[PDB]
JSON list of C-alpha atoms in Angstrom, two decimals:
[
{"chain": "A", "resi": 774, "resn": "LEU", "atom": "CA", "xyz": [33.26, 29.62, 18.99]},
{"chain": "A", "resi": 775, "resn": "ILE", "atom": "CA", "xyz": [31.83, 26.34, 17.70]},
{"chain": "A", "resi": 776, "resn": "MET", "atom": "CA", "xyz": [33.62, 24.22, 15.38]},
{"chain": "A", "resi": 777, "resn": "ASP", "atom": "CA", "xyz": [32.08, 20.94, 14.96]},
{"chain": "A", "resi": 778, "resn": "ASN", "atom": "CA", "xyz": [32.86, 18.38, 12.19]},
{"chain": "A", "resi": 779, "resn": "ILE", "atom": "CA", "xyz": [34.94, 20.73, 10.26]},
{"chain": "A", "resi": 780, "resn": "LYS", "atom": "CA", "xyz": [37.68, 19.03, 7.81]},
{"chain": "A", "resi": 781, "resn": "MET", "atom": "CA", "xyz": [40.97, 20.27, 7.87]},
{"chain": "A", "resi": 782, "resn": "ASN", "atom": "CA", "xyz": [44.21, 19.66, 5.87]},
{"chain": "A", "resi": 783, "resn": "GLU", "atom": "CA", "xyz": [46.48, 19.34, 9.16]},
{"chain": "A", "resi": 784, "resn": "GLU", "atom": "CA", "xyz": [48.62, 22.27, 8.34]},
{"chain": "A", "resi": 785, "resn": "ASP", "atom": "CA", "xyz": [46.08, 24.80, 8.97]},
{"chain": "A", "resi": 786, "resn": "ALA", "atom": "CA", "xyz": [46.13, 24.03, 12.47]},
{"chain": "A", "resi": 787, "resn": "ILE", "atom": "CA", "xyz": [48.80, 26.61, 12.92]},
{"chain": "A", "resi": 788, "resn": "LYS", "atom": "CA", "xyz": [46.65, 29.11, 11.16]},
{"chain": "A", "resi": 789, "resn": "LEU", "atom": "CA", "xyz": [43.55, 28.40, 13.22]},
{"chain": "A", "resi": 790, "resn": "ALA", "atom": "CA", "xyz": [45.79, 28.28, 16.50]},
{"chain": "A", "resi": 791, "resn": "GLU", "atom": "CA", "xyz": [47.02, 31.73, 15.30]},
{"chain": "A", "resi": 792, "resn": "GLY", "atom": "CA", "xyz": [43.71, 32.93, 14.96]},
{"chain": "A", "resi": 793, "resn": "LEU", "atom": "CA", "xyz": [42.68, 31.49, 18.52]},
{"chain": "A", "resi": 794, "resn": "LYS", "atom": "CA", "xyz": [45.46, 33.73, 20.03]},
{"chain": "A", "resi": 795, "resn": "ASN", "atom": "CA", "xyz": [43.61, 36.92, 19.07]},
{"chain": "A", "resi": 796, "resn": "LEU", "atom": "CA", "xyz": [40.35, 35.97, 20.48]},
{"chain": "A", "resi": 797, "resn": "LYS", "atom": "CA", "xyz": [40.97, 37.35, 23.79]},
{"chain": "A", "resi": 798, "resn": "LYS", "atom": "CA", "xyz": [37.36, 37.64, 25.09]},
{"chain": "A", "resi": 799, "resn": "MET", "atom": "CA", "xyz": [36.61, 33.95, 24.28]},
{"chain": "A", "resi": 800, "resn": "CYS", "atom": "CA", "xyz": [34.90, 32.08, 27.00]},
{"chain": "A", "resi": 801, "resn": "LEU", "atom": "CA", "xyz": [33.44, 29.05, 25.28]},
{"chain": "A", "resi": 802, "resn": "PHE", "atom": "CA", "xyz": [35.54, 26.96, 23.20]},
{"chain": "A", "resi": 803, "resn": "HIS", "atom": "CA", "xyz": [33.64, 23.73, 21.73]},
{"chain": "A", "resi": 804, "resn": "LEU", "atom": "CA", "xyz": [35.31, 22.46, 18.76]},
{"chain": "A", "resi": 805, "resn": "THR", "atom": "CA", "xyz": [34.31, 18.88, 18.60]},
{"chain": "A", "resi": 806, "resn": "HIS", "atom": "CA", "xyz": [34.98, 16.13, 15.90]},
{"chain": "A", "resi": 807, "resn": "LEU", "atom": "CA", "xyz": [37.87, 17.88, 14.04]},
{"chain": "A", "resi": 808, "resn": "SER", "atom": "CA", "xyz": [38.35, 14.93, 11.73]},
{"chain": "A", "resi": 809, "resn": "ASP", "atom": "CA", "xyz": [41.53, 13.00, 12.71]},
{"chain": "A", "resi": 810, "resn": "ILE", "atom": "CA", "xyz": [44.82, 15.34, 11.92]},
{"chain": "A", "resi": 811, "resn": "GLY", "atom": "CA", "xyz": [46.79, 13.67, 14.50]},
{"chain": "A", "resi": 812, "resn": "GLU", "atom": "CA", "xyz": [49.58, 16.66, 13.77]},
{"chain": "A", "resi": 813, "resn": "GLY", "atom": "CA", "xyz": [48.30, 20.10, 15.07]},
{"chain": "A", "resi": 814, "resn": "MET", "atom": "CA", "xyz": [46.27, 18.81, 17.65]},
{"chain": "A", "resi": 815, "resn": "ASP", "atom": "CA", "xyz": [48.75, 20.38, 20.03]},
{"chain": "A", "resi": 816, "resn": "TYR", "atom": "CA", "xyz": [48.51, 23.85, 18.08]},
{"chain": "A", "resi": 817, "resn": "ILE", "atom": "CA", "xyz": [44.94, 24.27, 19.34]},
{"chain": "A", "resi": 818, "resn": "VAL", "atom": "CA", "xyz": [46.03, 22.88, 22.82]},
{"chain": "A", "resi": 819, "resn": "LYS", "atom": "CA", "xyz": [48.66, 24.91, 22.95]},
{"chain": "A", "resi": 820, "resn": "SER", "atom": "CA", "xyz": [47.35, 28.19, 21.62]},
{"chain": "A", "resi": 821, "resn": "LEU", "atom": "CA", "xyz": [44.81, 28.12, 24.63]},
{"chain": "A", "resi": 822, "resn": "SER", "atom": "CA", "xyz": [46.07, 28.33, 28.36]},
{"chain": "A", "resi": 823, "resn": "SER", "atom": "CA", "xyz": [49.26, 29.85, 26.64]},
{"chain": "A", "resi": 824, "resn": "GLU", "atom": "CA", "xyz": [48.90, 33.67, 28.35]},
{"chain": "A", "resi": 825, "resn": "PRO", "atom": "CA", "xyz": [46.45, 33.91, 30.78]},
{"chain": "A", "resi": 826, "resn": "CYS", "atom": "CA", "xyz": [42.82, 32.91, 29.51]},
{"chain": "A", "resi": 827, "resn": "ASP", "atom": "CA", "xyz": [39.63, 33.53, 30.97]},
{"chain": "A", "resi": 828, "resn": "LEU", "atom": "CA", "xyz": [37.67, 30.54, 29.11]},
{"chain": "A", "resi": 829, "resn": "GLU", "atom": "CA", "xyz": [34.93, 29.22, 30.85]},
{"chain": "A", "resi": 830, "resn": "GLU", "atom": "CA", "xyz": [34.44, 25.58, 29.05]},
{"chain": "A", "resi": 831, "resn": "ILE", "atom": "CA", "xyz": [36.73, 24.05, 26.98]},
{"chain": "A", "resi": 832, "resn": "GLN", "atom": "CA", "xyz": [35.44, 21.06, 25.08]},
{"chain": "A", "resi": 833, "resn": "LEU", "atom": "CA", "xyz": [37.57, 18.69, 22.86]},
{"chain": "A", "resi": 834, "resn": "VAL", "atom": "CA", "xyz": [35.50, 15.80, 22.23]},
{"chain": "A", "resi": 835, "resn": "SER", "atom": "CA", "xyz": [36.16, 13.31, 19.58]},
{"chain": "A", "resi": 836, "resn": "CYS", "atom": "CA", "xyz": [39.11, 15.54, 18.00]},
{"chain": "A", "resi": 837, "resn": "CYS", "atom": "CA", "xyz": [41.96, 13.22, 18.27]},
{"chain": "A", "resi": 838, "resn": "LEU", "atom": "CA", "xyz": [43.82, 13.73, 21.47]},
{"chain": "A", "resi": 839, "resn": "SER", "atom": "CA", "xyz": [47.42, 12.31, 22.46]},
{"chain": "A", "resi": 840, "resn": "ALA", "atom": "CA", "xyz": [49.40, 12.02, 25.53]},
{"chain": "A", "resi": 841, "resn": "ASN", "atom": "CA", "xyz": [51.41, 15.03, 24.32]},
{"chain": "A", "resi": 842, "resn": "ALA", "atom": "CA", "xyz": [48.62, 17.26, 23.90]},
{"chain": "A", "resi": 843, "resn": "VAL", "atom": "CA", "xyz": [47.26, 16.33, 27.38]},
{"chain": "A", "resi": 844, "resn": "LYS", "atom": "CA", "xyz": [50.74, 16.98, 28.96]},
{"chain": "A", "resi": 845, "resn": "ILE", "atom": "CA", "xyz": [50.80, 20.29, 27.28]},
{"chain": "A", "resi": 846, "resn": "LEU", "atom": "CA", "xyz": [47.36, 21.32, 28.53]},
{"chain": "A", "resi": 847, "resn": "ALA", "atom": "CA", "xyz": [48.18, 20.14, 32.14]},
{"chain": "A", "resi": 848, "resn": "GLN", "atom": "CA", "xyz": [51.65, 21.85, 32.03]},
{"chain": "A", "resi": 849, "resn": "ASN", "atom": "CA", "xyz": [49.94, 25.20, 31.27]},
{"chain": "A", "resi": 850, "resn": "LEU", "atom": "CA", "xyz": [46.87, 25.23, 34.08]},
{"chain": "A", "resi": 851, "resn": "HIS", "atom": "CA", "xyz": [48.39, 27.65, 36.19]},
{"chain": "A", "resi": 852, "resn": "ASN", "atom": "CA", "xyz": [45.73, 30.15, 35.14]},
{"chain": "A", "resi": 853, "resn": "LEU", "atom": "CA", "xyz": [42.67, 29.51, 33.22]},
{"chain": "A", "resi": 854, "resn": "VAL", "atom": "CA", "xyz": [40.64, 30.10, 36.67]},
{"chain": "A", "resi": 855, "resn": "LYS", "atom": "CA", "xyz": [36.82, 30.34, 36.29]},
{"chain": "A", "resi": 856, "resn": "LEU", "atom": "CA", "xyz": [37.03, 27.44, 33.95]},
{"chain": "A", "resi": 857, "resn": "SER", "atom": "CA", "xyz": [34.20, 25.02, 35.26]},
{"chain": "A", "resi": 858, "resn": "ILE", "atom": "CA", "xyz": [33.88, 22.56, 32.25]},
{"chain": "A", "resi": 859, "resn": "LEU", "atom": "CA", "xyz": [36.68, 20.53, 31.13]},
{"chain": "A", "resi": 860, "resn": "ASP", "atom": "CA", "xyz": [36.12, 17.25, 28.79]},
{"chain": "A", "resi": 861, "resn": "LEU", "atom": "CA", "xyz": [38.44, 15.97, 26.36]},
{"chain": "A", "resi": 862, "resn": "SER", "atom": "CA", "xyz": [36.43, 12.86, 26.20]},
{"chain": "A", "resi": 863, "resn": "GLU", "atom": "CA", "xyz": [36.21, 10.29, 23.23]},
{"chain": "A", "resi": 864, "resn": "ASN", "atom": "CA", "xyz": [39.93, 10.65, 22.13]},
{"chain": "A", "resi": 865, "resn": "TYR", "atom": "CA", "xyz": [41.55, 7.58, 23.15]},
{"chain": "A", "resi": 866, "resn": "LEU", "atom": "CA", "xyz": [45.12, 7.74, 24.06]},
{"chain": "A", "resi": 867, "resn": "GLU", "atom": "CA", "xyz": [46.94, 4.65, 22.49]},
{"chain": "A", "resi": 868, "resn": "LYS", "atom": "CA", "xyz": [50.17, 5.04, 24.53]},
{"chain": "A", "resi": 869, "resn": "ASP", "atom": "CA", "xyz": [51.74, 7.13, 27.43]},
{"chain": "A", "resi": 870, "resn": "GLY", "atom": "CA", "xyz": [48.19, 7.71, 28.65]},
{"chain": "A", "resi": 871, "resn": "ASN", "atom": "CA", "xyz": [49.44, 7.03, 32.29]},
{"chain": "A", "resi": 872, "resn": "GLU", "atom": "CA", "xyz": [52.10, 9.44, 32.26]},
{"chain": "A", "resi": 873, "resn": "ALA", "atom": "CA", "xyz": [49.51, 12.18, 30.73]},
{"chain": "A", "resi": 874, "resn": "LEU", "atom": "CA", "xyz": [46.75, 11.25, 33.06]},
{"chain": "A", "resi": 875, "resn": "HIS", "atom": "CA", "xyz": [48.89, 11.24, 35.93]},
{"chain": "A", "resi": 876, "resn": "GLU", "atom": "CA", "xyz": [50.01, 14.71, 35.00]},
{"chain": "A", "resi": 877, "resn": "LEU", "atom": "CA", "xyz": [46.64, 15.88, 34.74]},
{"chain": "A", "resi": 878, "resn": "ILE", "atom": "CA", "xyz": [45.56, 14.44, 37.96]},
{"chain": "A", "resi": 879, "resn": "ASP", "atom": "CA", "xyz": [48.33, 16.10, 40.07]},
{"chain": "A", "resi": 880, "resn": "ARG", "atom": "CA", "xyz": [46.97, 19.37, 39.01]},
{"chain": "A", "resi": 881, "resn": "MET", "atom": "CA", "xyz": [43.63, 21.11, 38.91]},
{"chain": "A", "resi": 882, "resn": "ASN", "atom": "CA", "xyz": [44.18, 22.25, 42.19]},
{"chain": "A", "resi": 883, "resn": "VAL", "atom": "CA", "xyz": [44.13, 26.23, 41.13]},
{"chain": "A", "resi": 884, "resn": "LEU", "atom": "CA", "xyz": [40.92, 25.33, 38.94]},
{"chain": "A", "resi": 885, "resn": "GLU", "atom": "CA", "xyz": [38.71, 25.76, 41.83]},
{"chain": "A", "resi": 886, "resn": "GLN", "atom": "CA", "xyz": [35.48, 26.19, 39.63]},
{"chain": "A", "resi": 887, "resn": "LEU", "atom": "CA", "xyz": [35.65, 22.83, 37.91]},
{"chain": "A", "resi": 888, "resn": "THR", "atom": "CA", "xyz": [32.73, 20.45, 37.80]},
{"chain": "A", "resi": 889, "resn": "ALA", "atom": "CA", "xyz": [30.95, 18.15, 35.73]},
{"chain": "A", "resi": 890, "resn": "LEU", "atom": "CA", "xyz": [34.33, 16.96, 34.55]},
{"chain": "A", "resi": 891, "resn": "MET", "atom": "CA", "xyz": [35.29, 13.88, 32.07]},
{"chain": "A", "resi": 892, "resn": "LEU", "atom": "CA", "xyz": [38.59, 12.09, 31.85]},
{"chain": "A", "resi": 893, "resn": "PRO", "atom": "CA", "xyz": [40.65, 11.38, 28.60]},
{"chain": "A", "resi": 894, "resn": "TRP", "atom": "CA", "xyz": [40.15, 7.82, 27.49]},
{"chain": "A", "resi": 895, "resn": "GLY", "atom": "CA", "xyz": [43.60, 5.86, 27.26]},
{"chain": "A", "resi": 896, "resn": "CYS", "atom": "CA", "xyz": [45.69, 3.30, 28.22]},
{"chain": "A", "resi": 897, "resn": "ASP", "atom": "CA", "xyz": [45.21, 3.21, 31.34]},
{"chain": "A", "resi": 898, "resn": "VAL", "atom": "CA", "xyz": [43.33, 5.38, 33.39]},
{"chain": "A", "resi": 899, "resn": "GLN", "atom": "CA", "xyz": [42.38, 2.68, 35.61]},
{"chain": "A", "resi": 900, "resn": "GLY", "atom": "CA", "xyz": [45.58, 3.05, 37.47]},
{"chain": "A", "resi": 901, "resn": "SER", "atom": "CA", "xyz": [44.99, 6.49, 38.66]},
{"chain": "A", "resi": 902, "resn": "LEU", "atom": "CA", "xyz": [41.14, 6.01, 39.52]},
{"chain": "A", "resi": 903, "resn": "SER", "atom": "CA", "xyz": [41.88, 5.82, 43.39]},
{"chain": "A", "resi": 904, "resn": "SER", "atom": "CA", "xyz": [43.92, 8.99, 43.13]},
{"chain": "A", "resi": 905, "resn": "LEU", "atom": "CA", "xyz": [41.48, 10.83, 41.00]},
{"chain": "A", "resi": 906, "resn": "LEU", "atom": "CA", "xyz": [38.26, 9.95, 43.45]},
{"chain": "A", "resi": 907, "resn": "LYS", "atom": "CA", "xyz": [40.39, 11.24, 46.43]},
{"chain": "A", "resi": 908, "resn": "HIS", "atom": "CA", "xyz": [40.90, 14.67, 44.56]},
{"chain": "A", "resi": 909, "resn": "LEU", "atom": "CA", "xyz": [37.37, 14.51, 43.46]},
{"chain": "A", "resi": 910, "resn": "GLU", "atom": "CA", "xyz": [36.18, 14.30, 47.30]},
{"chain": "A", "resi": 911, "resn": "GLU", "atom": "CA", "xyz": [38.12, 17.72, 47.70]},
{"chain": "A", "resi": 912, "resn": "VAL", "atom": "CA", "xyz": [35.24, 19.34, 45.51]},
{"chain": "A", "resi": 913, "resn": "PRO", "atom": "CA", "xyz": [31.67, 18.65, 46.67]},
{"chain": "A", "resi": 914, "resn": "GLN", "atom": "CA", "xyz": [30.49, 20.99, 43.74]},
{"chain": "A", "resi": 915, "resn": "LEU", "atom": "CA", "xyz": [30.83, 17.96, 41.40]},
{"chain": "A", "resi": 916, "resn": "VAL", "atom": "CA", "xyz": [27.93, 17.59, 39.19]},
{"chain": "A", "resi": 917, "resn": "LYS", "atom": "CA", "xyz": [29.18, 15.05, 36.71]},
{"chain": "A", "resi": 918, "resn": "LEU", "atom": "CA", "xyz": [31.69, 12.64, 36.16]},
{"chain": "A", "resi": 919, "resn": "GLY", "atom": "CA", "xyz": [32.97, 11.08, 33.07]},
{"chain": "A", "resi": 920, "resn": "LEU", "atom": "CA", "xyz": [34.78, 7.84, 33.12]},
{"chain": "A", "resi": 921, "resn": "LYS", "atom": "CA", "xyz": [34.06, 6.38, 29.94]},
{"chain": "A", "resi": 922, "resn": "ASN", "atom": "CA", "xyz": [34.75, 3.48, 27.58]},
{"chain": "A", "resi": 923, "resn": "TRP", "atom": "CA", "xyz": [38.11, 1.98, 29.64]},
{"chain": "A", "resi": 924, "resn": "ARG", "atom": "CA", "xyz": [37.60, -1.59, 30.90]},
{"chain": "A", "resi": 925, "resn": "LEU", "atom": "CA", "xyz": [36.55, -1.54, 34.70]},
{"chain": "A", "resi": 926, "resn": "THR", "atom": "CA", "xyz": [36.86, -4.56, 36.96]},
{"chain": "A", "resi": 927, "resn": "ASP", "atom": "CA", "xyz": [34.47, -5.79, 39.81]},
{"chain": "A", "resi": 928, "resn": "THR", "atom": "CA", "xyz": [36.83, -4.24, 42.26]},
{"chain": "A", "resi": 929, "resn": "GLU", "atom": "CA", "xyz": [37.22, -0.78, 40.46]},
{"chain": "A", "resi": 930, "resn": "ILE", "atom": "CA", "xyz": [33.22, -0.47, 40.89]},
{"chain": "A", "resi": 931, "resn": "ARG", "atom": "CA", "xyz": [33.56, -1.36, 44.77]},
{"chain": "A", "resi": 932, "resn": "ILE", "atom": "CA", "xyz": [36.15, 1.60, 45.07]},
{"chain": "A", "resi": 933, "resn": "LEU", "atom": "CA", "xyz": [33.45, 3.88, 43.26]},
{"chain": "A", "resi": 934, "resn": "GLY", "atom": "CA", "xyz": [30.90, 2.59, 45.69]},
{"chain": "A", "resi": 935, "resn": "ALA", "atom": "CA", "xyz": [33.10, 3.82, 48.41]},
{"chain": "A", "resi": 936, "resn": "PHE", "atom": "CA", "xyz": [33.56, 7.01, 46.78]},
{"chain": "A", "resi": 937, "resn": "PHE", "atom": "CA", "xyz": [29.67, 7.52, 46.84]},
{"chain": "A", "resi": 938, "resn": "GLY", "atom": "CA", "xyz": [29.31, 6.34, 50.38]},
{"chain": "A", "resi": 939, "resn": "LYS", "atom": "CA", "xyz": [29.80, 9.34, 51.39]},
{"chain": "A", "resi": 940, "resn": "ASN", "atom": "CA", "xyz": [30.59, 12.94, 52.42]},
{"chain": "A", "resi": 941, "resn": "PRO", "atom": "CA", "xyz": [27.06, 14.58, 50.63]},
{"chain": "A", "resi": 942, "resn": "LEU", "atom": "CA", "xyz": [27.76, 15.67, 47.08]},
{"chain": "A", "resi": 943, "resn": "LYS", "atom": "CA", "xyz": [24.28, 16.75, 46.89]},
{"chain": "A", "resi": 944, "resn": "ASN", "atom": "CA", "xyz": [24.41, 18.26, 43.15]},
{"chain": "A", "resi": 945, "resn": "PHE", "atom": "CA", "xyz": [25.89, 15.19, 41.80]},
{"chain": "A", "resi": 946, "resn": "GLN", "atom": "CA", "xyz": [23.29, 14.90, 38.50]},
{"chain": "A", "resi": 947, "resn": "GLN", "atom": "CA", "xyz": [25.01, 12.68, 36.02]},
{"chain": "A", "resi": 948, "resn": "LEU", "atom": "CA", "xyz": [27.18, 9.74, 35.87]},
{"chain": "A", "resi": 949, "resn": "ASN", "atom": "CA", "xyz": [28.90, 8.81, 32.58]},
{"chain": "A", "resi": 950, "resn": "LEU", "atom": "CA", "xyz": [30.09, 5.17, 31.97]},
{"chain": "A", "resi": 951, "resn": "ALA", "atom": "CA", "xyz": [30.32, 4.01, 28.38]},
{"chain": "A", "resi": 952, "resn": "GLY", "atom": "CA", "xyz": [31.86, 0.85, 29.02]},
{"chain": "A", "resi": 953, "resn": "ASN", "atom": "CA", "xyz": [32.28, -1.51, 32.12]},
{"chain": "A", "resi": 954, "resn": "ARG", "atom": "CA", "xyz": [32.25, -5.29, 33.19]},
{"chain": "A", "resi": 955, "resn": "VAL", "atom": "CA", "xyz": [29.84, -6.65, 35.09]},
{"chain": "A", "resi": 956, "resn": "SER", "atom": "CA", "xyz": [28.20, -9.67, 36.58]},
{"chain": "A", "resi": 957, "resn": "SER", "atom": "CA", "xyz": [26.31, -11.28, 39.58]},
{"chain": "A", "resi": 958, "resn": "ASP", "atom": "CA", "xyz": [28.58, -9.61, 41.74]},
{"chain": "A", "resi": 959, "resn": "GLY", "atom": "CA", "xyz": [28.53, -5.84, 40.33]},
{"chain": "A", "resi": 960, "resn": "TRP", "atom": "CA", "xyz": [26.28, -3.88, 39.89]},
{"chain": "A", "resi": 961, "resn": "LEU", "atom": "CA", "xyz": [25.25, -5.56, 43.14]},
{"chain": "A", "resi": 962, "resn": "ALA", "atom": "CA", "xyz": [28.82, -5.19, 44.48]},
{"chain": "A", "resi": 963, "resn": "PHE", "atom": "CA", "xyz": [27.72, -1.59, 44.97]},
{"chain": "A", "resi": 964, "resn": "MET", "atom": "CA", "xyz": [23.69, -0.98, 44.00]},
{"chain": "A", "resi": 965, "resn": "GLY", "atom": "CA", "xyz": [21.97, 0.79, 46.60]},
{"chain": "A", "resi": 966, "resn": "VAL", "atom": "CA", "xyz": [25.26, 3.39, 47.41]},
{"chain": "A", "resi": 967, "resn": "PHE", "atom": "CA", "xyz": [23.07, 5.42, 44.71]},
{"chain": "A", "resi": 968, "resn": "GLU", "atom": "CA", "xyz": [20.02, 5.78, 46.70]},
{"chain": "A", "resi": 969, "resn": "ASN", "atom": "CA", "xyz": [21.56, 8.61, 48.66]},
{"chain": "A", "resi": 970, "resn": "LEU", "atom": "CA", "xyz": [21.73, 10.54, 45.33]},
{"chain": "A", "resi": 971, "resn": "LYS", "atom": "CA", "xyz": [18.13, 11.01, 44.41]},
{"chain": "A", "resi": 972, "resn": "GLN", "atom": "CA", "xyz": [19.28, 14.27, 42.34]},
{"chain": "A", "resi": 973, "resn": "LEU", "atom": "CA", "xyz": [20.41, 11.94, 39.70]},
{"chain": "A", "resi": 974, "resn": "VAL", "atom": "CA", "xyz": [19.25, 12.89, 36.38]},
{"chain": "A", "resi": 975, "resn": "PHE", "atom": "CA", "xyz": [20.68, 10.46, 34.20]},
{"chain": "A", "resi": 976, "resn": "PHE", "atom": "CA", "xyz": [23.39, 7.63, 33.87]},
{"chain": "A", "resi": 977, "resn": "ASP", "atom": "CA", "xyz": [24.95, 5.06, 31.45]},
{"chain": "A", "resi": 978, "resn": "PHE", "atom": "CA", "xyz": [26.48, 2.46, 33.63]},
{"chain": "A", "resi": 979, "resn": "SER", "atom": "CA", "xyz": [27.10, 0.80, 29.95]},
{"chain": "A", "resi": 980, "resn": "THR", "atom": "CA", "xyz": [28.72, -2.55, 29.25]},
{"chain": "A", "resi": 981, "resn": "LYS", "atom": "CA", "xyz": [29.47, -5.05, 26.47]},
{"chain": "A", "resi": 982, "resn": "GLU", "atom": "CA", "xyz": [26.94, -7.62, 26.71]},
{"chain": "A", "resi": 983, "resn": "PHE", "atom": "CA", "xyz": [25.26, -8.87, 30.23]},
{"chain": "A", "resi": 984, "resn": "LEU", "atom": "CA", "xyz": [21.92, -10.04, 31.20]},
{"chain": "A", "resi": 985, "resn": "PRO", "atom": "CA", "xyz": [21.18, -8.87, 34.87]},
{"chain": "A", "resi": 986, "resn": "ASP", "atom": "CA", "xyz": [20.53, -10.93, 37.59]},
{"chain": "A", "resi": 987, "resn": "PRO", "atom": "CA", "xyz": [16.79, -11.00, 38.81]},
{"chain": "A", "resi": 988, "resn": "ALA", "atom": "CA", "xyz": [17.90, -9.95, 42.02]},
{"chain": "A", "resi": 989, "resn": "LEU", "atom": "CA", "xyz": [19.68, -7.07, 40.68]},
{"chain": "A", "resi": 990, "resn": "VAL", "atom": "CA", "xyz": [16.58, -6.06, 38.57]},
{"chain": "A", "resi": 991, "resn": "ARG", "atom": "CA", "xyz": [14.36, -6.05, 41.40]},
{"chain": "A", "resi": 992, "resn": "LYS", "atom": "CA", "xyz": [16.78, -4.22, 43.47]},
{"chain": "A", "resi": 993, "resn": "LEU", "atom": "CA", "xyz": [17.62, -1.55, 40.53]},
{"chain": "A", "resi": 994, "resn": "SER", "atom": "CA", "xyz": [13.68, -1.20, 40.03]},
{"chain": "A", "resi": 995, "resn": "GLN", "atom": "CA", "xyz": [13.53, 0.12, 43.90]},
{"chain": "A", "resi": 996, "resn": "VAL", "atom": "CA", "xyz": [16.66, 2.13, 43.60]},
{"chain": "A", "resi": 997, "resn": "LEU", "atom": "CA", "xyz": [15.19, 3.96, 40.34]},
{"chain": "A", "resi": 998, "resn": "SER", "atom": "CA", "xyz": [11.85, 4.35, 42.02]},
{"chain": "A", "resi": 999, "resn": "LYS", "atom": "CA", "xyz": [13.26, 6.51, 44.95]},
{"chain": "A", "resi": 1000, "resn": "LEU", "atom": "CA", "xyz": [14.91, 9.00, 42.63]},
{"chain": "A", "resi": 1001, "resn": "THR", "atom": "CA", "xyz": [13.74, 12.35, 42.01]},
{"chain": "A", "resi": 1002, "resn": "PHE", "atom": "CA", "xyz": [14.42, 12.97, 38.21]},
{"chain": "A", "resi": 1003, "resn": "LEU", "atom": "CA", "xyz": [15.69, 10.05, 36.19]},
{"chain": "A", "resi": 1004, "resn": "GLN", "atom": "CA", "xyz": [15.13, 11.93, 33.01]},
{"chain": "A", "resi": 1005, "resn": "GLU", "atom": "CA", "xyz": [15.71, 8.99, 30.76]},
{"chain": "A", "resi": 1006, "resn": "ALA", "atom": "CA", "xyz": [18.23, 6.30, 31.91]},
{"chain": "A", "resi": 1007, "resn": "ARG", "atom": "CA", "xyz": [20.85, 4.71, 29.94]},
{"chain": "A", "resi": 1008, "resn": "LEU", "atom": "CA", "xyz": [21.94, 1.26, 30.50]},
{"chain": "A", "resi": 1009, "resn": "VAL", "atom": "CA", "xyz": [23.23, 0.02, 26.96]},
{"chain": "A", "resi": 1010, "resn": "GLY", "atom": "CA", "xyz": [24.70, -3.10, 26.66]},
{"chain": "A", "resi": 1011, "resn": "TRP", "atom": "CA", "xyz": [22.58, -4.97, 28.92]},
{"chain": "A", "resi": 1012, "resn": "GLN", "atom": "CA", "xyz": [20.26, -7.91, 27.68]},
{"chain": "A", "resi": 1013, "resn": "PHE", "atom": "CA", "xyz": [17.03, -6.37, 29.21]},
{"chain": "A", "resi": 1014, "resn": "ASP", "atom": "CA", "xyz": [13.65, -7.81, 27.96]},
{"chain": "A", "resi": 1015, "resn": "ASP", "atom": "CA", "xyz": [9.82, -7.63, 28.61]},
{"chain": "A", "resi": 1016, "resn": "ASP", "atom": "CA", "xyz": [10.43, -9.57, 31.65]},
{"chain": "A", "resi": 1017, "resn": "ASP", "atom": "CA", "xyz": [12.72, -7.12, 33.41]},
{"chain": "A", "resi": 1018, "resn": "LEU", "atom": "CA", "xyz": [10.67, -4.13, 32.30]},
{"chain": "A", "resi": 1019, "resn": "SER", "atom": "CA", "xyz": [7.69, -5.40, 33.96]},
{"chain": "A", "resi": 1020, "resn": "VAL", "atom": "CA", "xyz": [9.76, -5.55, 37.29]},
{"chain": "A", "resi": 1021, "resn": "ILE", "atom": "CA", "xyz": [11.45, -2.20, 36.47]},
{"chain": "A", "resi": 1022, "resn": "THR", "atom": "CA", "xyz": [9.55, 0.59, 38.15]},
{"chain": "A", "resi": 1023, "resn": "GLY", "atom": "CA", "xyz": [7.96, 3.97, 36.30]},
{"chain": "A", "resi": 1024, "resn": "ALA", "atom": "CA", "xyz": [10.59, 5.97, 34.59]},
{"chain": "A", "resi": 1025, "resn": "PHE", "atom": "CA", "xyz": [11.03, 8.23, 31.66]},
{"chain": "A", "resi": 1026, "resn": "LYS", "atom": "CA", "xyz": [12.75, 5.82, 29.57]},
{"chain": "A", "resi": 1027, "resn": "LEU", "atom": "CA", "xyz": [15.46, 3.15, 29.79]},
{"chain": "A", "resi": 1028, "resn": "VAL", "atom": "CA", "xyz": [17.63, 2.74, 26.84]},
{"chain": "A", "resi": 1029, "resn": "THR", "atom": "CA", "xyz": [19.30, -0.81, 27.08]},
{"chain": "A", "resi": 1030, "resn": "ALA", "atom": "CA", "xyz": [20.40, -1.26, 23.31]}
]
């Protein structure tokens, strides 16, 4: 079931939730862009995972989530095994984000099949990054990791560097990061740690506005050169120009704007 950018009157969330309850064979639920209803977001979340479900992918992107909707999901994650994809990305949580995120992090210990996960954006996931990474080390099958939009520091990227040390992931192909804070120390703070992850297909490492240190551009070029796929890099928010593109090695493309 795909319900992409469908405008709703909020109240119908109940009727839709009731419809979903009868779809006992559902495997893929993608919703996405469910306007901005606010009220009822929990009805969609509640209807799923309530009563043992066999869903393999649950994608709720830009649908407007709240700390309560996230807590409700986490509370019901006692079943829903064989779930592999769980996103809930691009749904900023204005308040109580920490409580909802902590409840989620403390779970996902029965969902053995989870991989290529993204986290809810909200205030303030940074405080639980260390806990997340420690738990991600428990699942070598991780293919992708989404830590988008929220503000990072020069110390958070060093923690990620340590995470990518590391006991081999092998199949980690994508890194999603729609926002960061970078300087003359970072990416250089961790750059080179990804030379051990040559299977990478793409990554964002995005920021707001920063012109890369010549040392970083030269190192980046070598890091990119040694990758196996690199099927279109995205490095958005970086002030790269013709001089850096000359230094940067051959690649399918690099999106910097």
